[PDB]
Design an enzyme around this catalytic site. Structure first.
Site, PDB file in Angstrom:
ATOM      1  N   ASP A   1       0.711  -0.901  -0.019  1.00  0.00           N
ATOM      2  CA  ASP A   1      -0.092   0.242  -0.299  1.00  0.00           C
ATOM      3  C   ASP A   1       0.727   1.233  -0.247  1.00  0.00           C
ATOM      4  O   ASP A   1       2.054   1.334   0.549  1.00  0.00           O
ATOM      5  CB  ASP A   1      -0.578  -0.110   1.176  1.00  0.00           C
TER       6      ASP A   1
ATOM      7  N   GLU B   1      -7.484   4.808  12.533  1.00  0.00           N
ATOM      8  CA  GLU B   1      -6.900   4.775  13.406  1.00  0.00           C
ATOM      9  C   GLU B   1      -6.200   5.532  14.315  1.00  0.00           C
ATOM     10  O   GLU B   1      -5.340   5.301  14.903  1.00  0.00           O
ATOM     11  CB  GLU B   1      -5.405   4.211  12.331  1.00  0.00           C
TER      12      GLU B   1
END
Ligand SMILES: CC(=O)N[C@@H]1[C@@H](O)[C@H](O)[C@@H](CO)O[C@@H]1O
Ligand SMILES: CC(=O)N[C@@H]1[C@@H](O)[C@H](O)[C@@H](CO)O[C@H]1O
Length: 214
Positions: free
Chosen positions: A20, A110
């Site tokens: 990613d 997150e």
């Protein structure tokens, strides 16, 4: 419904090899990435309701022209509207003409931004459902073990997870998920065509979009 204790799977060489990236990585040579055996590339698209990743388009086109499967993720900022962010995220994908991504749209959650467990989880659900409504496609949640155990509640378990937990062959005990479709196991990988530490992932076939509401 579980009839016995389930547990997270371990890494397997037969899972999809993935990475990613975001603007942080700058220019990437995807032909090199492909030659390294990488099969899936998740790309950062947006963050909050104001930031657009400048490299999203070139990463999408660069990866696709080499035959790599691609997905996009949005970095959630709970201090901004959930539906607002979902629309900002999808609007940008359309702006860059990314209309053939292969992998589930990912919610990168997150940080709490001060929001409580129940409320933060509800915001995530609103985001996911709005993305589903707008695109007619499926979604996946990205987060890390401790965050799942302490900052979110089990309602998010109704969605598949792309879990981050470095330095282990199996993600740690999770109070929300007992199986993963994505596993980010390193943030320091050396991948051809990518400068500096690269996020390394394993994905199962369930990471792919295989349905539409339209
Ligand atoms: C899906 C993913 O790995 N996203 C990461 C995020 O976790 C990290 O906080 C950020 C800054 O380093 O870069 C990427 O956006
Ligand atoms: C390389 C490519 O085009 N990506 C496809 C993806 O669209 C599809 O959902 C998946 C099903 O297994 O197979 C991948 O190879």
């Amino acid at each position: 419904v579980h009839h016995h204790h389930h547990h997270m799977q371990s890494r397997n060489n037969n899972n999809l090899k993935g990475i990613d990236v975001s603007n942080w990585k700058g220019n990437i040579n995807f032909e090199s990435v492909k030659n390294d055996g990488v099969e899936v590339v998740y790309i950062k698209a947006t963050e909050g309701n104001y930031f657009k990743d400048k490299y999203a388009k070139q990463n999408y086109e660069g990866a696709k022209e080499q035959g790599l499967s691609v997905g996009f993720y949005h970095f959630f900022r709970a201090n901004k509207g959930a539906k607002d962010q979902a629309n900002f995220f999808i609007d940008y994908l359309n702006e860059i003409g990314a209309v053939n991504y292969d992998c589930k749209l990912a919610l990168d959650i997150e940080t709490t931004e001060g929001v409580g467990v129940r409320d933060l989880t509800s915001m995530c659900i609103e985001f996911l459902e709005e993305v589903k409504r707008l695109t007619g496609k499926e979604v996946v949640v990205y987060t890390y073990t401790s965050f799942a155990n302490n900052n979110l509640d089990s309602r998010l378990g109704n969605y598949p997870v792309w879990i981050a937990h470095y330095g282990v062959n199996t993600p740690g005990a999770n109070n929300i998920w007992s199986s993963w479709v994505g596993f980010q196991y390193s943030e320091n990988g050396s991948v051809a065509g990518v400068n500096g530490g690269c996020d390394m992932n394993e994905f199962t076939e369930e990471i792919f979009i295989d349905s539409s509401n339209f």
